[PDB]
């Protein structure tokens, strides 16, 4: 039995990379060499967003492009009005060990979790005027590495137990588990339609999942080291990943392979976080060495640097209207850039 | 300032009242000793947690001579340690548990597994500055076993007696020789048993020496 199944697995691995290689008629570079460069991206820190007292681990924008949640190891989930720098809420976490946070597409909820193995869902819009824990999504057996809401009742969460899970929040219940990663899953990105998501893991692999059918559609494997960061390109047909390889990589869904890589010889450090600009033309990546690099996503030219942090950039988010990027850091600050 | 509406002014006032509570909770959090509790599965962690108190992180709180201690047992986590061990970079001291009785027990040898774990934690890039409290947790059952079975089960390289003194001291040195970075790190080893107060006093002693040495870095004397 097992030797024949292993031969058939290796034979399918030959057939699938042969099918990818048959698609590879020209590389993205050959198609974008004739396009004009971005020029220098010279963003300025327009806001510094100060009240966290430990490392920022995560942030997420609201869909309004004005509120952002952020989470730090001081056990606070802070909601910021980015325009005024006002703290809208500071939410005391039951476990300080938060590694991720998400803000619902409605702005009604924030989610967070980490080394507690729980994704806590916080209702922002109570009649009581405090923020309350509405649900605790217990059922992962390793740390919560990522959360993303699909809507007020559906959240996809990623874990150190090597699984993603989709939850029904009102039942408190993982309605789907996604199991095919062999390493700890570190990151999620929902597709723009929320029918798909990608997750990147410590087996240096990214998997595309169908949310509704509960299955891995595609696996992507060009990274030499563990994927910390993942983001859909804004069309939903491709995604970027960032890893401890000190590379980002852009992968097609439709052609099922790597298009391009984003690295410079003087970049030697793990990519913590990844985001696209609204047109997808800029790929923003956050690093240890304490900065964010902006890439021409079409050329892989390093288009600019967001050099304002004193410790590891742990987070990025571009706003949904594309106006700004917020970058979060282990130095305990969030900086907003334009 | 005239540029802010009556509601903007009340939102800035709320934001500043949130700052006042964040800053107050930071003052509370700064006076708390963060302790990361490590060691292999049966290493005596639970005996330590009982004495100190008397899946996911088990965070336990104790108070001793007005230091407040938070103990993070990361033992129930089963996941890739280099993805989350950097959460603990701001820890005061690691407490590392070793079952001293496990020199002649199987995982392939448990004492060598404890040493490989200790080496990887001790010499970690996130903990270069961070001291370690070793608890060698089962000195009674080690005295019962050492009379029956030699340390040569773990260390064929050894050449002392199967008396408690020479065997226990050799094991302590077999862990403390795993320190690289001796310029910036200290190990506070303590032989441990069924004992209510002395182990908690040892954490307080070793943590006070660690805080003094952190303060002496913060003012250039160390």
């Amino acid at each position, epitope marked *: 039995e097992l030797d024949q199944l292993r031969q058939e697995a290796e034979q399918l691995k030959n057939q699938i990379r042969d099918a990818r290689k048959a698609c590879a008629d020209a590389t993205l570079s050959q198609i974008t060499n004739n396009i004009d460069p971005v020029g220098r991206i010279q963003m300025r820190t327009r806001r510094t967003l100060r009240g966290h007292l430990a490392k920022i681990y995560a942030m997420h924008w609201g869909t309004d492009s004005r509120l952002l949640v952020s989470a730090s190891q001081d056990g606070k989930l802070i909601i910021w009005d980015s*325009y005024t720098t006002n703290k809208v809420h500071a939410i005391p976490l039951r476990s300080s060990w938060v590694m991720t946070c998400a803000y619902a597409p409605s702005g009604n909820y924030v989610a967070c979790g980490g080394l507690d193995n729980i994704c806590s869902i916080y209702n922002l819009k109570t*009649r009581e*005027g405090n923020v309350r824990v509405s649900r605790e999504l217990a059922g992962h057996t390793g740390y919560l590495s990522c959360c993303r809401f699909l809507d007020d009742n559906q959240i996809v969460t990623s874990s150190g137990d090597t699984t993603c899970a989709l939850w029904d929040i009102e039942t408190g219940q993982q309605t789907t588990t996604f199991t095919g990663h062999t390493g700890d899953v570190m990151s999620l990105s929902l597709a723009p339609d929320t029918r798909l998501f990608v997750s990147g893991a410590c087996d240096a692999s990214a998997k595309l999942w169908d949310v509704r059918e509960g299955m891995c559609r595609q696996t992507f494997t060009g990274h030499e080291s563990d994927i910390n960061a993942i983001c859909f390109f804004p069309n939903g047909n491709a995604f970027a990943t960032g890893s401890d390889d000190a590379t980002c990589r852009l992968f097609d869904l439709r052609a099922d392979q790597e298009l391009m890589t984003y690295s410079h010889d003087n970049i030697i450090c793990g990519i913590t976080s990844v985001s696209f600009s609204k047109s997808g033309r800029l790929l923003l990546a956050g690093y240890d060495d304490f900065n964010c690099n902006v890439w021409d996503a079409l050329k892989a030219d390093r288009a600019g640097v967001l050099a304002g942090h004193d410790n590891r950039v742990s987070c990025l988010g571009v706003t949904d209207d594309g106006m700004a990027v917020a970058t979060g850091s282990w130095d305990s600050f969030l900086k907003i850039w334009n | 300032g005239c540029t802010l*509406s*009556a509601e903007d002014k*009340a939102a800035v006032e709320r934001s500043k009242m949130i700052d006042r509570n964040l800053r107050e909770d930071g003052e509370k959090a700064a006076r708390e000793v963060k302790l990361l509790l490590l060691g292999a599965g049966e290493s005596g962690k639970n005996t330590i947690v009982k004495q100190m108190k008397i899946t996911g992180i088990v965070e336990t709180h104790f108070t001793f001579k007005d230091l407040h201690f938070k103990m993070f047992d990361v033992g129930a986590q089963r996941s890739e340690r280099k993805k989350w061990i950097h959460c603990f970079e701001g820890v005061t001291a690691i407490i590392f548990c070793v079952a001293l009785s496990d020199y002649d027990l199987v995982l392939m040898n448990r004492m060598h597994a404890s040493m490989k774990l200790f080496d990887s934690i001790c010499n970690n890039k996130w903990f270069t500055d961070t001291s370690i409290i070793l608890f060698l947790n089962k000195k009674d059952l080690f005295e019962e076993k050492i009379k029956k079975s030699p340390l040569t089960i773990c260390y064929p390289e050894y050449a002392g007696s199967n008396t408690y003194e020479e065997a226990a001291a050799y094991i302590q040195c077999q862990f403390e020789d795993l320190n690289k970075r001796k310029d910036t790190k200290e190990i506070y080893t303590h032989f441990t048993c069924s004992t209510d107060t002395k182990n908690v006093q040892f954490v307080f002693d070793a943590v006070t020496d660690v805080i003094i040495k952190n303060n002496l870095k913060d003012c250039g004397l160390f």
Partner: single-chain antibody, 232 residues
């Protein structure tokens, strides 16, 4: 959520009463609190404000120095110590919640009121109407105007619309000119130019009977319209 209110009944002119308002079922310390007066058969008048954590206090000039707003967060209680009462103070006083952050709904909850019977350059809000006799099912379009533009430099327009039903305390319908409150049906909608404003009740119902007040929140003192009643 409640605001239950006591101190009231008869008092002589020159006299004094402590109004109190005990909050329950909400995070009282995080809310700013207002008192709003309503003189018998007259409109709403804002009296006093105390912010969350007492850091800001405001009064109407009709009560400034003469009334003091006080607050006991550990007792979830709000007070109005009225030190030198006059016939012009005879009213139902409503304790009112407000909370201020981006996208919040201030004035969202009003207590049942307490009645005080004293024995015997502000932004002007105008509704250019007093009563409207009308029938269920059809649309209604109440309107208001301000002496100053309520459209601020930040892009908010600070109208609030309140409905007060007969024998009941006011209820927030619309906050910040466009936005309808929690538990208010989509039948109510708000619009305006920055100086003129409309509340549309798109399909009227028998529960919509009552006095409708605009209020500005651009500047203190807060000022209400005179109120327009809808009746069957």
């Amino acid at each position: 959520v409640q605001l239950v209110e006591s101190g009231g009944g008869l008092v002589q002119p020159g006299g004094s009463r402590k109004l109190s308002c005990s909050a329950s079922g909400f995070a009282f310390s995080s809310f700013g609190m207002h008192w709003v007066r309503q003189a018998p058969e007259k409109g709403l008048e804002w009296v006093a404000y105390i912010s969350s954590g007492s850091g800001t206090i405001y009064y109407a000039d009709t009560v400034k120095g003469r009334f003091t707003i006080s607050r006991d967060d550990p007792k979830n209680t709000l007070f109005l110590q009225m030190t030198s009462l006059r016939s012009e103070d005879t009213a139902m006083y409503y304790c009112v919640r407000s909370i201020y952050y981006y996208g919040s709904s201030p004035f969202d909850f009003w207590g049942q009121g307490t009645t005080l019977t004293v024995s015997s350059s502000d932004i002007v809000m105008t509704q250019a109407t007093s009563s409207v006799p009308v029938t269920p099912g059809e649309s209604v379009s109440i309107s208001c105007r301000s002496s100053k533009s309520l459209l601020h430099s930040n892009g908010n327009t600070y109208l609030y619309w309140f409905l007060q039903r007969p024998g009941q305390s006011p209820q927030l319908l619309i906050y910040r000119m466009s936005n309808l409150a929690s538990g208010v049906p989509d039948r109510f909608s708000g619009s305006g130019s920055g100086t003129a404003f409309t509340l549309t009740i798109s399909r009227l119902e028998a529960e919509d009977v009552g006095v409708y007040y605009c209020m500005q929140h651009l500047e203190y003192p807060l000022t209400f319209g005179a109120g327009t009643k809808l009746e069957l």
